């Protein structure tokens, strides 16, 4: 359960490809156009979702 | 349990200044500490 060999920079970096995070499920809010928000989520600014304040 | 269960009395009636100066060799201890320079004796 103990490595015999150090892990090179090359292998380290080849493994750290898929560890990244992605751009979130982002969209615009049409109440304010800009101030992009998450899709299927309330807008923090406009308090809106399908026009209605919340 | 463990091996140090403190007591002020048992600390000072063994390792204390008076117990040192009560004895010929315990005075050499204080001299070795006075000679070395320890701020705390006993």
């Amino acid at each position: 359960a103990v490595p015999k060999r150090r892990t090179s920079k090359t292998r380290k970096n080849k493994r750290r490809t898929h560890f990244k995070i992605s751009v979130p499920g982002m969209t615009e809010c049409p109440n304010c156009g800009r101030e992009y928000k998450l899709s299927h989520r309330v807008c923090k600014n406009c308090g809106s979702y399908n026009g209605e304040e919340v | 349990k463990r091996t140090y269960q403190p007591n002020k009395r048992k600390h000072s009636k063994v390792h204390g200044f008076r117990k040192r100066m009560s004895t010929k060799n315990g005075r050499k201890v204080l001299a070795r500490r006075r000679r070395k320079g320890r701020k705390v004796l006993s």
Partner: protein
């Protein structure tokens, strides 16, 4: 069905607390799964308030908590009273869907998805 990081009895009590708190407050801020499970509880309770029988009060007391809410007439009232007297009278034409959910967004501490759940 669904289990919520809790054993069976803890789940039952959490669900009763959420139902009752909803009945009091008309909207609560929770996590989406607990919402998705307590909507069933709530809606079945509204159905009992609509059936309106004594046996239905007796069966909804098995699932509600004994709480005291002060009214805007400065009056003392219970969850079950509020339910069978106000909430089931609001929805007398509505055949289900007594509750909605609004996905709010990811919470700071635990990365949880907060929601708002209310009984419109």
């Amino acid at each position: 069905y669904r289990k919520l990081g809790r054993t069976s009895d803890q789940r039952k009590a959490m669900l009763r607390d959420l139902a009752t708190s909803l009945i009091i407050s008309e909207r609560i801020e929770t996590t989406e799964a607990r919402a998705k499970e307590v909507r069933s509880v709530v809606e079945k309770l509204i159905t009992l308030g609509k059936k309106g029988d004594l046996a239905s009060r007796r069966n909804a007391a098995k699932t509600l908590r004994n709480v005291e809410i002060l009214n805007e007439d400065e009056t003392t009232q219970t969850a079950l009273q509020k339910l069978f007297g106000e909430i089931a009278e609001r929805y007398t034409e509505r055949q289900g869907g007594y509750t909605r959910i609004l996905k709010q967004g990811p919470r700071r501490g635990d990365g949880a998805e907060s929601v708002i759940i209310e009984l419109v």
